[PDB]
Design a protein around this ligand. Structure first.
Ligand SMILES: NC(=O)C[C@H]([NH3+])C(=O)NS(=O)(=O)OC[C@H]1O[C@@H](n2cnc3c(N)ncnc32)[C@H](O)[C@@H]1O
Ligand SMILES: NC(=O)C[C@H]([NH3+])C(=O)NS(=O)(=O)OC[C@H]1O[C@@H](n2cnc3c(N)ncnc32)[C@H](O)[C@@H]1O
Ligand SMILES: [Mg+2]
Ligand SMILES: [Mg+2]
Ligand SMILES: [Mg+2]
Ligand SMILES: [Mg+2]
Lengths: 434, 434
């Protein structure tokens, strides 16, 4: 390959050097007698100056016709100039038009289009600066997670997607024909991580999880990226510490690296700066009391939906935990609170600013009889979970874990109006394409 | 949590120190008047010495009954002793039996069981040393990939799994009901990576890919982990360099870190040591000539199946490329060789020692008309690929990419007899459970 110079590399210190840009036309404007093409690539935008008396009439005329997203190779000499973007521009010697474009269907400012148009053209939308910014933030949060997980001694595993068990209820299961059998798409890798702790003790996975959720909210996708941890020996309080340490490191690392991207989306970084341990912790009992005190008609035992969480966040300026939920609005696998068996040892981590739940986790039931009984009480067939029950027969240990919704976290970090914008190609009940 | 000391931490230099082990009984043997329990955890095995006159009769009797996989907490004093495993043992002061076990259904040496028993009990099999070793090698190869990808300036993206397009043919597609519509499980994220290069230039993803492959071979799963790269500006030769640099770094890094694990599986590390650029490259034409020279009844235009690849590997002592395949045994998206349009600019990377294909990649067709025509020739509906065709309308650039089968790579690195052992919970046409 003939090497390119990235836009971010075009700096005043390269004054007088030859560079080869490769990218796409961002804007095309005649300035005096010259054509100024701003060329975008993955790293920034550079001003390329095209002079008729330098490139000749043929190239000059071609340059006039280059609309947004025209693919081009540009060779020229860098000139330091305090007036140009980045304090340096390229004086064009040669212009190769790969493909001229005049009708790119995403507007120059995407937010002047209907969100439905942007989704119809999601494959084109993702190359635009804000959409690309979201993907850079996403990769950085995940890289940060992997740094923390490696340093803290967790093992990465690669759990199954095709499964036969519901982890998070039958209502959100996708079912498919699988040769002579039927399979489900995994809602969560948790049950498999629980098997894996017996060999590896501290495990984690990042997998797509699948939820056939009919409700079309701004916090639900039908497919999302799910970062999940499970650890032998740890109780609920232990796993909550892991959660706050991990989330804080993810947020602080992304603040350090992606400030520019975050500032495209936020006027106020306060809640992100505030994201360091210890996070505030309230019981579900306290949550009910707070909600009732603000006039919300909620009763002990009621589910905390998105609206309840939203009101609860008003009292917090960083992520916070709610723990000790009523047993019967919580998953079959969660351990009872031994001090109060009406509750389970579960906690959710809620993001502030109205965002609500980003992590759900718990200590797991480690007693065989108790777990079997919960399976039966929930109308589940123990046959489908015999392997999971085996984990309580062959050297059971106390253990706990959690799942973080990556898109949910990105949506809070960037104050997105909908979780769909944090997925590369979002999936919702009416959206499968592109 | 009360902190534990890991087995690998029990070293002669801790002589006289109190430690708390937490783990599972590996073996239980009476030695003289004492009970020797070898305790395994995620990091190794430690000899714990239980003396009746120290722990008392009740604890001593309990210790006699502890079979393999009994979950235990052991507190005691480290004693340096050249005779013990690791040169240090723990003299037990306190023994807490969490759960006693006497009938763990995986044999002490798993390979004395039918592979079908091991798969029936896959959830139990994975905690055993060799199976756990494979997972450590897998996480290390992947960590190595991420190190290389970050250093070389690639962006991580998180592409969709629910899709409407076949990338790699209709025959291996899983189809499912999706609300009022139908969806497919992604065979490969490639088409979406191609969309993503327009914003991010150099992209990669690690995703589960799904192949409804009826043939039950030792190189096919119905679900596998697929590491895929796509890059703007790069041609086939460029992407081949990326492939050899990445694979070499993965292998060399895993050799550096996981020598102990690899030596459980290999007598000979030669081919791994040999895995550094430049890898040997032969044309498909040369491959046919080699095969015919060894008496294989293959003709130019024929598909190279597993058996052909196996024979071809006899001539190589490290991974190697085969390039320039006949157009009509290759995918619809691949770019024709401009020098010879009977061929496409595709290459596979084959592992030696009979293993064969670990990567398939190509330069992509970047001409709209040519791609449309190939879609139509293959009996595909261009409507299902309109978005993919858009990538050839709105600033097309030359580009290339590839997919690496992680399990396929693990199977070669560890000389596994079947790819299934490199998946945490393998999926094959008759195996969906556990
Ligand atoms: N390993 C575990 O302990 C996780 C546990 N099995 C689990 O799946 N919990 S969860 O349903 O709360 O999902 C966990 C998180 O996953 C996110 N989530 C959960 N459902 C969705 C949907 N439908 N869309 C997007 N994101 C979703 C959200 O952040 C939740 O807090
Ligand atoms: N992004 C790309 O350019 C990849 C391209 N779309 C692709 O899917 N190619 S491939 O079919 O050869 O699959 C790529 C690799 O994926 C592996 N593979 C491909 N199929 C399987 C099955 N069924 N089981 C396990 N592993 C499999 C094998 O290592 C192949 O070399
Ligand atoms: Mg809830
Ligand atoms: Mg939840
Ligand atoms: Mg082939
Ligand atoms: Mg192939």
């Amino acid at each position: 390959m003939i090497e390119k110079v990235y836009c971010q590399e075009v700096k005043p210190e390269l004054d007088g050097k030859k560079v080869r840009l490769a990218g796409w036309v961002y804007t095309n404007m005649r300035v005096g007698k010259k054509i100024f093409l701003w060329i975008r690539d993955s790293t920034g935008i550079v001003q390329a100056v095209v002079a008729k008396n330098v490139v000749g009439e043929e190239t000059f005329e071609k340059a006039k016709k280059l609309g947004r997203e025209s693919s081009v190779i540009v060779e020229g000499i860098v000139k330091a100039d305090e007036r140009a973007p980045g304090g340096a521009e390229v004086h064009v010697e040669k212009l190769e038009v790969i493909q001229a474009v005049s009708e790119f269907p995403i507007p120059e400012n995407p937010e002047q289009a209907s969100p439905e148009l942007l989704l119809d053209y999601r494959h084109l939308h993702i190359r635009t600066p804000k959409a690309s910014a979201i993907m850079k933030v996403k990769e950085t949060l995940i890289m940060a997670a992997r740094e923390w997980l490696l340093k803290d001694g967790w093992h990465e595993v690669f759990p199954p997607i095709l499964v036969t068990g519901a982890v998070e209820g039958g209502a959100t299961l996708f079912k498919l024909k699988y040769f002579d059998k039927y399979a489900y798409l995994s809602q969560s890798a948790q049950l498999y991580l629980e098997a894996a702790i017996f060999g590896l003790e501290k495990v984690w996975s990042l997998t797509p999880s699948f939820r056939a959720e009919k409700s079309r909210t701004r916090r639900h996708l039908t497919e999302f990226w799910h970062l999940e941890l499970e650890a032998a020996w740890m109780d609920l309080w232990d796993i909550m510490k892991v959660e706050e340490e991990l989330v804080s490191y993810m947020v602080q690392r992304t603040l350090e690296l992606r400030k520019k991207e975050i500032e495209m989306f936020r006027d106020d970084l306060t809640t992100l700066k505030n994201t360091e341990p210890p996070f505030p912790r309230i019981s579900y009992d306290e949550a009910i009391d707070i909600l009732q005190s603000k006039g919300v008609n909620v009763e002990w035992g009621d589910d905390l939906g998105a609206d309840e969480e939203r009101v609860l966040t008003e009292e917090f300026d960083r992520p916070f935990f709610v723990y000790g939920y009523p047993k019967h609005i919580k998953a079959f696998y969660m351990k009872e609170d031994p001090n109060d068996p009406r509750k389970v040892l579960a906690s959710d981590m809620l993001a502030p600013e109205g965002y609500g739940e980003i992590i759900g986790g718990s200590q797991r039931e480690d007693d065989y009889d108790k777990l079997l009984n919960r399976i039966l009480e929930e109308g589940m067939d123990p046959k489908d979970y015999e392997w999971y029950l085996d984990l309580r027969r062959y050297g059971s240990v106390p253990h706990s874990g959690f799942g973080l919704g990556v898109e949910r976290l990105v949506a809070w970090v960037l104050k997105l109006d909908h979780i769909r914008w944090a997925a590369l190609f979002p999936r919702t009940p009416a959206r499968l394409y592109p």
